[PDB]
Every structure is written in structure tokens, then in C-alpha cells.
Design a binder for these strands. Sequence first.
DNA 1: TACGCAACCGGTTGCGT
DNA 2: TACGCAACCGGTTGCGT
Lengths: 338, 338
Amino acid sequence: TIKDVAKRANVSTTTVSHVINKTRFVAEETRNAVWAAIKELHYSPSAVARSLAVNHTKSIGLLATSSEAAYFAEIIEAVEKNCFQKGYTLILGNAWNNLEKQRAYLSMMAQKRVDGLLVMCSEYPEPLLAMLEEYRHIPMVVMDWGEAKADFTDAVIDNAFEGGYMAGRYLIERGHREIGVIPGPLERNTGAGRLAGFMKAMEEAMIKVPESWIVQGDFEPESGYRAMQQILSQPHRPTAVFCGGDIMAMGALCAADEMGLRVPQDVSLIGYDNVRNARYFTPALTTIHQPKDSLGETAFNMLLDRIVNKREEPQSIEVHPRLIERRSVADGPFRDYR
Amino acid sequence: TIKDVAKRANVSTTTVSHVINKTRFVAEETRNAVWAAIKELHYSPSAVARSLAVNHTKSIGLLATSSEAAYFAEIIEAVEKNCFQKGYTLILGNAWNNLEKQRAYLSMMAQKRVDGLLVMCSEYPEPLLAMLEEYRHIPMVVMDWGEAKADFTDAVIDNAFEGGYMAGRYLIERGHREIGVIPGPLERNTGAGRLAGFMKAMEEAMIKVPESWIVQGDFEPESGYRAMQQILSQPHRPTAVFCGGDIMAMGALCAADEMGLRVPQDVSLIGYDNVRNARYFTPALTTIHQPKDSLGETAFNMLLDRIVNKREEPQSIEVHPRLIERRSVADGPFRDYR
DNA sequence: TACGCAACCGGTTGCGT
DNA sequence: TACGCAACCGGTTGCGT
Ligand code: HPA
Ligand code: HPA
């Protein structure tokens, strides 16, 4: 079709090309003609052809987990903005924590020749690590580790442990000693990590959390529901609960209300994520905020670099959690005694 | 690189090709050799090269609006599943209801030569319609119209008016006559449409909704908040509210709680969308459910068809809304008098 | 000066033998 | 029998003049 233009224009394709990508000087007349031709023929230049030639697709792939989940959803929306803004095309791929799906997506991606890769796999078993190395040649940055698990990628780290610690503290400082926790999957940073930071703060305070008080979530509202329930369903129940993520949080609020328990009057609840609607949870949720957007652009940035500045050495950027006080927490019984 | 394989294998590339795409018979030995070569060289065949040749990218583009919003998020997640499953690669593009962004994305898309296009633009001004026609050559289906606005595309229709009518009815049948509404943007189907179905049911019942009782939302929690507030902030207030979408709903629940109003004891509220967490809103939200997934796969399906079966005639499939009874509605004052 | 030639990127596939 | 030749898809870009 580029020939078709050149022909109408009575110039070479080489010419047509250059004008289109202003990559060398072209006489005005000449320029105009090509533009005209380009217009009547309704010419869209093939990017595949161009990619074939130039050796880069100008498109980047997101090998995610799930994309509906608030947390995830927010990051992705961010990522895209960034790609758009710097002319990159986004390939969204959800592997659902399934190795096969993951080997699958990884391969189409490579074949489609993505310029770089954004990785959000949630859980990372050896096998997954292994596959990843297999594609060390394609530039990449993992956005979900707590510390860097491999030398062949960039990493952005979130300080999930310092956010976890922040949560317990707040609780401690507000009057609490009988507290419960509903963590997310231990095979995850946001899971394991947040829990540990949260547990440290407790040891520091000589607060022991009885095992019947710790109930595993999976980040979904239902787990929030089940757990909150199992927690208060007991003879002896805490006065405060630390919940691994805002959505499960929102689930624990339901159940409490359903048991007829008052928040935060009967139980205070602290969240984690500061998701876009957390303020509209009822009551407005006090949670720890995770810089999602920065989490996004920061990853993009490291990627681009590696891409354009062809960096070869793995980098790792840290980002920081921060408390957001809302209305779901209340003074504990020990407030005045501090 | 295909040459590189052929060379190790001591066969022609033609050969190497065929074996890889089992597109003609190959002696076992021969086959093995190529596979071996393919292996040591760690060969990933270029899809761009192949696309260049075969004339199709095997990738489809989603020209969306926003992707974080529950509603949207859910559809997209669906769409992807479908693409994956039939070997298509997804290009997510959010135009944010901005013409430019939209002309922009539309063009990269064409240049990237997407096999087909999924369109979710929310509002459709002439200019936007116009651009769309400009690309009638690329197969497409709009997923968000109420009725079909153009002959050059497929459409999936949701019956937003029958869902709107369903909502009012329920209210009517539960005892209500003083009702309010917070609709979404009138420039949208889900906006305008739902409101009209809702308004019809009312005329039928000789129920007039006073203008101070109708407050525009924008589908976001905050509008839900502001409106619910402006509604109850009045001398005279309804006994029930119909809210255009679940999230804004979730916003109206906040405010009511914040004004110290009880749901549904002081005000019943009916939603619309049946979003994945609506059951966990507090109280669990009674809403009208929109088949999001079907809404998704159905679109994919029409697309593929047009793609593979090269259909030329615009098609249009209808999908159906349905009531979901939860805990946010209560008997109105006129229940017993029916 | 302002522009054109022809090889190249990496595969597919119709004819042959 | 089982496989190879060479043109083609649609652009880019080093040498020239
Ligand atoms: O893995 C996760 N899933 C959903 N929400 C989350 N928030 C933090 N981590 C996660
Ligand atoms: O345009 C919309 N935006 C967000 N949620 C929605 N639910 C229906 N339509 C919409």
C-alpha cells in the first residue's frame, strides 16, 4: 500500500516513507503530494511491517494475575495511562496463578515480541521463577515481590512489612491488646509480608495473638466474611481486627453487621490497601494506603529505561505505605493507661 | 532465525516451517531434527513476521472508557478470558471519553492491525460516530448501546429500559410511592435508558417524582454520596431510592449512614448492576443484575464470526437484566393496601 | 540539492520434482 | 515420496548522484 501512495504521488516509497516519519528533508511540494495521496488512499501504515523492519513493536505486555480485583484493577489502569502517554500499546494477560496459563501467555508474548514485560504473578514457585529466566532476554520488571528474588529482572518493592507494622502500632496505640488478624495468602508478599510486619509490632508489645484469632483470607470479600465470622463466633473475641486487604475488609464489615456487631463500637477494624472506595465502605474505612499509581509508573519507568537506555543491571525501587485514618477504629480499653 | 534452524537441521526453512505448523507431512527423523534445532537455538518464531505474511495479527483490541470501575472491570476480565481461550491477544485501550485520546487509540489500533475491535465508549457524539465509520473496514462490535446506532457494526443490547422498569415495579409492589432517583449520565444508555424504564413504571402507577427528588450521578461513589445527601437533606424526603448503579449505590449507603439514617429502615435503596461485591455492601444490596460475562462473550462471539465467517451484515444481540433480592429494601407504607 | 535503488527484516506457500 | 525454490507480505535505510 505504501507503493500505492508513492505511485499516486509520483515519488519513491523511500520518499513517502521519510515524509511520513519526517526522517530526512523533503521539498514542500513533494511533501504535500504525499500527504494528498496518503489522504485519498486513506492510508494507514502497517505497524507490523514497520516492526518487522525496525525491530521493536512499541508495545508492552502485562502478565498479570486477575484484573477485576480493585487492587489489581487500580494498578493496571495506572500502567495503561503510562504506556499511552509514551506511545506504547498494552497487552493485558491474566494467568490466574496457573502455571500453564502462565507458560502460555509468556510464549504468545515473546512471539508477539513485546518490547518489555510487566510481571504481577502473585505467587512465585520455583517453576515459575524458572520460566521467567527463560525469557531473561526480554526486558522485564516484577511489580509484586517484597525483596528481589532474581538477578535477571528489575523490581519495585512495597515495604509490606513496614505497613504491617504500622497497622499493629496504630491498634496498640489506640488502646488495643486483644486483636485478631485475617491475613491474605502466605505465598504472597502482600500476604506473608504484611502479616509479619504486623506480628513484629505485637511481639514488641508482648501481645500474643492466640491462634483462634488468626484466620486466613484469600483477598476476596467472602474470606473476609467467613473469617470475621469465625473470629466473633468465639467465646472470647478481640476488640480489634487487622484485615490483610480492603475488600476482605469490606467482607468482615458485612458479617459483623450481620451478627449484629457494631463497627467500630463493638469491634474496630483496620484495613490495608486504601482502595478507591474504602472511604465509602460503611463505616469509612481506616486503612494503610499502598501507593498504587506510583507503584505503576515506577515500574513503567524502570522498564523503559532498560528498553531505551539498554541497561543490563537489575534495579530495584522501594515505595512507601502510609496510614490513612478513617472511621472504623476506636479507642481500646488501654488507651488511658499509656 | 528460522534460517538458523533450517541450517542446524540441514533442511529448508520451508521444511522447518511446515513441521512447526504441521501444515504438510514430514518424515519423523526430519521432524525430530527440526525440533532439536528449534530447541538448542531456543527458537521463538516471530509472530510479526508471520502476521506480515499471513495477513492477520490474531489479536483484538478493546477500545474502552475506564477499566478500574467495577462494572467495566468485570466486563473486561470476561472479554480477556474469551480471547485467551481462542488464542487471541488483547489490547486494552482506555479513551476516557476523550475524543482525541479516542482518535489516537483508534489509529494505533488500526496501524497495529487488530483483527477486530470491541467498543465500549460510554458516550457517542456524532464526531465519535463519524470516526468509527472511518474504520468500518476493521470488523467491530459496540458493546454499550441501547439500540443500534449504525449499520457498520455489530451490537449487543442490554435492555436497560426493561431493567429500569423492573426496579420501579419492585419498589411499587413493596409499598412505595415517594421515591427518588439518582441516575447516571443521560448521555449513556445505562444512564438515560435505565432512567426511562424506571420512569415508565411510575407513570403507569400515577407516581410523580418531584424534581428535587431526581439527582444526577456520574456512576462514582462520590455522586452517590452527594445525591443521597441532597435527597434526604430535604424537608420532605422519599421512602425509597432508585440508584442508577451499584457503586454510586454504595455511596448513597455511606451518606445515609453518615446522616444517621437507617437502611433500609429509614430509606430503602435499590441498586443496579449486581456487581461482584454488591452482596457485601452493608446491607447486602438488592439490585438489578446485568449479565456482564454473557455481555462479554456474546460480543466476542459476534466479533469472531465477522472475522472468521467474514460476515458483512450487522448483527445485534439482546441480553437480559434481572432482579436480585437482597437486604436493602423494605415494605413501603402502601404494601397492605394492594 | 532533493530524492531514488535495492537489500533487508522473518517468515509463508504455490509450484515442482 | 518427502521435501526445496523463490516470490511475497510492507515497509526501512545505507549508499549514491
Ligand atoms: O493478591 C492480591 N489480590 C487482591 N488484592 C490484593 N491486595 C494486595 N495483594 C492482593
Ligand atoms: O458508564 C458506566 N460507568 C460505570 N459503571 C457503569 N455501570 C453501568 N454503566 C456504567
